[model samples]
Target: NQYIVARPVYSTNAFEENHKKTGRHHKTFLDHLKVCCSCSPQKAKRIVLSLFPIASWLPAYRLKEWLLSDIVSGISTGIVAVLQGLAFALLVDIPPVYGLYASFFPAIIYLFFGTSRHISVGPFPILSMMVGLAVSGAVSKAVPLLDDERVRVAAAASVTVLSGIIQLAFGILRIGFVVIYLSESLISGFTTAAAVHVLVSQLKFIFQLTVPSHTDPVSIFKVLYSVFSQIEKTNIADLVTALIVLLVVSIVKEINQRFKDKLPVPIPIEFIMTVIAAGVSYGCDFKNRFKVAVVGDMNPGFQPPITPDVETFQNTVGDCFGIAMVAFAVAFSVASVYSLKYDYPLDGNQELIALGLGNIVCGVFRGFAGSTALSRSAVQESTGGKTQIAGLIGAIIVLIVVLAIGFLLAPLQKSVLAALALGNLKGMLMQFAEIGRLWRKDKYDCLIWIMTFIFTIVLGLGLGLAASVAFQLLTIVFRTQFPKCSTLANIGRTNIYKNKKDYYDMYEPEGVKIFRCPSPIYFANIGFFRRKLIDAVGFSPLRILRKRNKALRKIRKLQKQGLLQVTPKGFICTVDTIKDSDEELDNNQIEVLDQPINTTDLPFHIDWNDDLPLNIEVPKISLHSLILDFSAVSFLDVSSVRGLKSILQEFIRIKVDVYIVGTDDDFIEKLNRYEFFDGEVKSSIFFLTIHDAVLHILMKKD
Candidate 1:
């Protein structure tokens, strides 16, 4: 009886202690559990499995907590989505349901795969325009194949699928590095241009004109000009209503920007302004009294049983590729930049997969392409979102709103939406000035940006991609053709070389002019290099002759026709032979010609010594022993290295002592591997800093 009593008391005490520890564990575990189960890993893993089914996120049985979180997130996202969707619908003149359709799928999909706590993926202004442009072109081409909205939707779905497949392939292959080829300036310029296209295309709707929808700014402008020419037929009431809404919204935004700190709590100043504009527009009877366009009444129910059309799937797959690429670029650029600023690691590959999966699922649900929302992300960060759970919550809110209160948005005015779109467009167009800045910073980048911009505007977006790739290739070619180079020599205690233009002050040794070939020798530049060296050797004599005779004219005609621009030091020559001569023109006379002159007079001027046109005056510099500087050269393939050796051998044969300086380790290694430096001229190959090389040559000469 004593043993039994003691055992029961002991068991009760043990049970009490265990229960206490379990309660503590439950609190800690639940905290981690919320984070783990919120949105990121679950969605990301689901996407990775290629099951982009909406059910993955929607059907989880976390009822109370998940529902509240989802509802809030979904509502917040839904509001923004409604605004954005309406903007897209107005811009493209599509049915308001299309905007709602774009909003629903993408939000839900992003809720699962996106890792960022605040990036609300939806129908952005720039992206919607891109889709419109892409689809409009395809529809025009496939008129016979796709005659109705069903077929068009099918085409769009096809584009989406293709885009998803491509994006998934990229993610799987870890080819996210390809995005680096798109320069920031190019992206910004293209976006600005595309935004202009969108804004201009939507102007007809804003004015309640029956102008045809066209992506080209010129076409839109022409239509607008024609419409305005018939101003008597304009809907004055609609125009006034749109103007008022635009003015109110603009003033509100400006005020918000100016005195945001003093604004009332709860709603953002922009949101409040939007609401005011919508309320005023609503009161105006835009459709009936003002003759303004309306979104019309839309069924506020989910189309849950709708299956994606096969043809729509094909068209969408094609169209979605472009949207996906652009979205990826925009999202990754924003994410990467912020990540750097915050000193955090961002997996670009993972981000690509996330965005790709988001779009795939978005398409599966008949929504348009989506990307990271810069504004929402900033807000989330500012509001202290600990993880992607915030974004998940936001997406959930959008879903609930789409399911329940989406009908309330049907009466939204097209002009109000157009105003919102114009506002967004204005934001995008602000990046246009970056083109000029880029031109000043780097001509290569400016070229790329301009080419991409022009191609995107003139040619379609697909061709623009090809043009961008071509521009990059051209950049590489130009770099190789006119690689930076200079001369190396000795000056006092320092061996120095003039690299590019800045080091021209370096003193060369007597009878020796050290030229720094800062780029790899190649076929494209070989002839130019040879001529430059020759001119350097003959520069002093050429200058003297030029000074003696200023009026001497030697006109030569070309055998093959080609356009040539005159340099400051005018030296003109075609790829073919000279065909004419003007008079007994001296070399000095050619040095002063500054204007482009085409001559077809006096054929048969084929004297390499005397008959060569006087317009081709070589630089006034002497060269005997030529020293090639290889510093500041970053790359040298085997072909280039071999080309250098051949050139050096030619100089050697001419009794010119060729010297090499500033050979970096990589260059030297390349040369060594080619066995070009393993000969009797090894002593001639000297490694010195550009400055030191100049001083050494000067000291030797002294």
Candidate 2:
């Protein structure tokens, strides 16, 4: 039965602030510092656990079962992480062993610091390519890069260290939410552009052309020019190997993907192919006979902790900024999705700390930068990885690779890793489809995608990312400057008010005006807010009064300008009575409309009335009151509120009662915080709804 039980009460903000504060809101900083700075368990417990997530999850894991799933996922995820590690390290233009080091340390650290279990932290192509740019940019005027490999590695390490420091600062400041500026549209475009850059870099390796390094803004074109110029010098063995290996990898991946539901596990063809290619290169003297480029020689075991060069931070600060931005953006994009799906909350600041600590560890080990890999993360999830245990296990496997069987991979063709890197970019290239879909769904997103791609492809990764972010910010300014102002009207028989422009038959109620300010009022567009408000309700009294005052300064402006005349020995009108009805004037007199002539300018009862009568007419202001709907105002800053105050006082001067309506208690509270609500309350300038204001105005007139 759809009947009310006992005619039960209905309400919904009909309820009080009804919200539970949970202790975070409405407090001063010093009181918060009492809990934050204290060491006692009751006061500081939540703060401690938020910073150290293992405190919460580890206790739950200590008694948990199911060791078998973790073991299986660990092995599978390790294999992919290892392969991607080796591939992306080359993308960073560092020695292959650093990739293994980069792969191991971050995954191990992320396990302890990160809450996300699905994302596998490791070397990723975009960050690697950015590091390569930072590392290869410059050492000195005379030092050959051939002589400066370790020095440049220090520069790459510096990039990682600085990026880690920046991220750590963001975490401490609780600034991780600023990543919202990296909208989904921006992220897609950035990656799409980065994919092209990664491809260009791998081309040099795939062709084995000994071209000089190009590091300018236009380096992509220079890279292509250099590669083509040395086409005659291309290593035939390397080119042939890349073509064959990439074809095999693509076909196997396609088959595995096409029949995933029917298979127990996707084929481990990429890893198997790597082993086979390395072993065969050893068996055949290909490096000697076919001139195949091989990853020759290695120093075994982990390098001792190398302090990243401090001076390189100065050299590569810009690169570090780009790295920090992209790394956090990429990591959180994946983490947020899984957090949402499993109904678990994520701490954005904690994620920044996790990523920062992992990179800081990698930097100390003289390894290139790393972030979570989406492809490897998918493999980790599909293989039933339940905890960071899988990543911890994968780090162990890579530890073994670094110390024991490192030399076995000495004969692995560099072309094979090149092919692996190129093959993986298929995911990035497929974003072109999204560009099309976004064009239909949201054209701004399409424009973002195109510009991000074009700029990165042309300007290189670091500058391109900066440009894309700057462009997105510019759109915000553009949107604010030309706000889409709408006239809102009440929905019939409902308290809800909506934009009248959205409804065809809707007309504004008589004598009541409503305006919607959809954008937050801020400095960038305060001028527009002031101008739009003036336009909406006709000119404010301040504007009208100012023009009248300006005319007084120009009073001597000839009879051709105005009709106020001065006579010698003129005696002024002492009578205070002022009245004006419709009148006509001759052609010689200048026209003045709605302007008042002061009695001091007239001769009282002196038969001079004929001349002065044509001089003035009092202004006719039609609207009695103005209703400003604050329903759409989310927040107001000082400048905007000040501009609004001028508007309020101006209307008050002209005797037009301006009533503000549809302001929530929260907004009214904010108004109180600014002390802007003063005097308005005494004057009864506030109303709960537009209808209430309209009815009050009607009652006053009655």
Candidate 3:
């Protein structure tokens, strides 16, 4: 106030013309729409284009070069799609034909709406298993719906519908980044657990065990105990058929991989296995010889497409939430892989719309929810798919299988279907290799991986997902709450400031003390900052008093012995420092001591373990100035500002000058609003740089 005159402040910088109003960032739905629709007409057209991604690329379609490859790829992918749908459909415990329906119908809608040119969208193992779990609960013997396959299909359809609606809302709101919430480590762990679930589900078919299907978290335990309890009843005939199917499929897949480049369409192992397994079982009379289960008769043609029974949603939406999140995660991750390979951009939210509509359409056709088929997507890529046209062709092949070529898909025993699914899981099980890398890179990531796997296995799908997300969040809060902070000082003659511990040569300027807090002083950490600040600057009254009392123990005795000079300057006493019998003392370093220890200076005046400042102010050690270097803080909250006020007032009470350094306009204005530092604690006390504050302190003191 003394050095400057008050003049009206003028904007030296140009006013940005399009600056929106400062306050009221949120508005109700209609009001928000009004604001949105008020944008330029040219911008509104872009919103339409963003919603329909196919509109962008369809105009450039070259049917000649693109068509042949799409047809070959689509038909190639369709065979696997059909086989997987049939196999996974059995996992969900639904009619095999509905699996074919699920495999194709979603692909049809995705052909138009899906963004990934290479992704072959269809039923996947995890999603099918999730749907089966839902249907199993509904068709339990305890429920009246037992023996009614109609209600089972409808229940599966309802899960698809619910998942679709949730996904659709995500796309519309542009919230597709939700998939990012599941980290790669978490996903690997989750998929590994799901593989176990898939295999555990197949155990009954493998051994001819008649144990009940279990979907609870403890279902794995129940399943193992039941199999053990009835171990002797395991059928010899079914085990041989399962072993034979598994071995043949494994060998054929190895052959395909061995000579993958030589094969025209990747040696359709599923189709070959389907034929061999069913034929051997039928031809050799293995079903009767081993007294084994056999494939049942097939129903021909399309079933009437019906809307999902909405009532089933009330009972299954909880399961549907977990299924929806995992479904999108799998699809997005698969699409991202090819998107990276081809170097093309894909909007996560746009993919959400495609998957959502695919599910919605699948539900209408009485099919369960699905994700992109990893193996089918691989097959499509190997055949050089150019567009979603490949998906259309694959769906067409599946449609033909249902409507015209329905006789080809005669039922094999469930164990063969289990083997089909089992072969597909080799990729998922391989993800366990990530554990070693996670452990070496960061143990926390390893911890997340291990915990997510354990919980997902023990707590079922839905509960386990929630637990892992919560578990990850706690680590974040822990870091913020106990962030590493350090004291800062000048490194050299330069203006740069660095942590004192990091730069061993760094030192504070004469007559000034600098402390730095490297994280945002939020409510969770503000108190910690205060305590550390007090300790770093020797401002803890308890600490100072303890030292003061110890110094007096000897200095007072010397004073009574007349060895201490009572200065004519009244309160100041000149004394030579006393040395212990085994110690060395420097007489040249002796200085005036102000007031021998008083009762009030005792550190024992207060006994406590609390974060807050005491009612009795803990005074700083002998000091003329304190500089708080807030170079790392990026956010400002009122609680922290209020805390600043309390600490600053305590410094003022002790007549110590306080300086703030490395603050921006936002932080200053926020403090200004609270009238903090509004009066005499201004001018030289505030600096935009630490060097300037230190410089000012040096000049004033000298």
Candidate 4:
């Protein structure tokens, strides 16, 4: 099935404007306003339809094919959402019942405004923990001794509302593109580290031991220390229950994963475990008999609406930017994945608006922040769910639980909830293995992963997010400032040129070195560019010029003394017969010859390589031509332009013909702007390709 193919030359003209012209005419501000002001009824209606994607899609729903599919998928997703909400609540340090409110409200709001058809948006452990950290930090500083649960709840609500406001503003400004900078490596490292934080936070619940909550960046360490020291207080009953839950859930989920295609859908192992644990706890009165912690009483219906506490905004506002960006970054990426797979249109700005509105509206009802969970979205998409209609159905299921049968879930042990959350962490924690893969693939990315993970765990998430972003950006600067110069050679007389060392069939023209620079020429790397250019050509032009000047000085001295004779072509050199005493043409003697020598007096071209009158040692320059390949050079700055001009002149002085090949038209314009071709250097030195220039050199030499 495999056969060798010919390597074809991919010839491209950098000067050719091959792109099709857009028909749009330029308009002034008033002209733009004139176009904007004339909105027809149909156009106005279309704009509104775009804002609420559901209004357009819900009408076209294929009830015959998708209705039953959505119903089944939605109920399954809703049940999972309920269990996850209760489980993730422990992460936020909030009441587990409020997590139900979180599950109910966000899905309903997202149904009206969200862009993705398949993603199930709800409380995610990482975002919940971020909110919890901010809440605790604020509450500790503002009302340290009060220990008011209402204050803590209000603080959480305020941060969520502020984060929502931020996302809303970012959406309006079309700042969704900033998510590209988070980088996959950075997010993997950050979430994996946060998963560790979640694991540490759940220890007390799993062991039923007394360990104090920590609000600092080093909270994981504090928790670990306290957990180990208090191991004696561990409750055997809760520990046994947690271990069993972990084992059963891990094995069943692994089975579900391995047979995902064979099975109709993943078994709802978490919900099944939750029900079983609740029943056993209730039958045994585990809360009283075994001193185990349960979910306890939760008000059946939604609590009266509470506004975001404006006073706590000062404390929580600082952390909300990282929260908002991270939440949107994760959710939008998940939405994009499903959108791309299913071939549906997804708007990033609209998704931000959807998430913002969900948080703002949900926070009013005592719900914390929400984002897309890949596990939840995977369930929705893999179950034959086709649209957001499935999301609506899921919300309805959660609504039914909240309004009618939520009390039955109160007897579930908190340790079981923690274990459920813990069991789901295998995916996040496994991201650690990415370090090994990245180390082998790209050491820079490996460092990024390691740095992000270490800094996030060490500096805490907010500062860690900022630090990782800065470090990732620095990697860009770091690479650009240290580009490698590869000398290129022709491949079998073809126009194509490749790095000389990479291809065995490559042939370089005699007396020519083709220097290739892979990065833009700028102030940061101009010096490096100069040195590498000289290195590529195997000689430094400036140093060669200096040696030639010194040799010429001794020739001038011997000629003035009438010890040498000049001919029409050049000096008839018997100068090698001069004694060693004449070789001591020291700096003082050469100083007298520094005055400009009259080339008219000699009327000949002196070859520095010939037997000179002086014993000065001049480095040999083997090449007579240099072809600089600018195909990979992206841009040039003023400093690099000046440096380049000096380099060209140095080679020209040495009588080496220098030609530049494959420069973009824009690059020529930059040189023109910098007056690069104003003197001895001329535009004639430029060529379309290295092969063309080589052909020209051959013709000229003949």
**What's the lDDT of the predicted structure labeled candidate 2?**
0.75
Between the candidate structures 1 and 4, which one is better when assessed by TM-score?
A: 4
Scored by lDDT, the top model is 4
- List ranges where model 3 is wrong by over 4 Å: 1-35, 38-45, 138-146, 244-265, 502-504, 541-620, 636-641, 659-686
Could you give candidate 3's per-residue lDDT for residues 1-702 as a string of tens digits? Answer: 434434322111111123343664556898877877667887877777777767877888998889899898988888878878887877777678888889888888877777889988888888887877776665552244434677788888878888888888888898999987888778888889888877777777777777776767777777778887887998877777677777877888788888877887677777777787777777786766777765465577777777766667767777778778888999999899999999988888888898899898888878899978788899898886988888888999998988887675563677777777888887788888988999999777787788888888898777787888877766555667876767677886676777778867877775577888877887888889889888777665335444444444444455566655434332123433344432123565333222234434332332222221212122334567788877678776888888877777656534568877777766766667767665545634567667666766777788
Please report the TM-score between candidate 2 and the true structure: 0.83
Which 10 residues in a row give candidate 1 its minimum summed lDDT?
A: 3-12
Model 1 bad stretches (over 4 Å): 1-77, 143-147, 213-233, 260-285, 304-320, 373-386, 435-452, 465-469, 472-484, 496-506, 520-524, 537-625, 672-702
| TM-score for all models, in order of appearance | 0.70, 0.83, 0.80, 0.85
CA lDDT, candidate 1, residue 557 = 29
lDDT of candidate model 4 versus the reference: 0.82
Q: Which of the two, 1 or 2, has more lDDT?
A: 2
- Residue pairs in candidate 2 whose N, alpha carbon or C atoms collide under 3 angstroms: none
lDDT of 2 at 354: 87
Q: Give per-residue CA lDDT, model 1, range 50-111, as digits (tens).
A: 43323443454456554455444444444566667666645434456666666666655555
Candidate 4 lDDT by residue in tens digits, 532-607: 9888888888777766666666677777877777878666555556654445567667443333223556778666
Name model 2 segments beyond 4 Å from true: 1-26, 42-59, 62-65, 138-146, 341-345, 488-512, 538-543, 546-615, 673-683
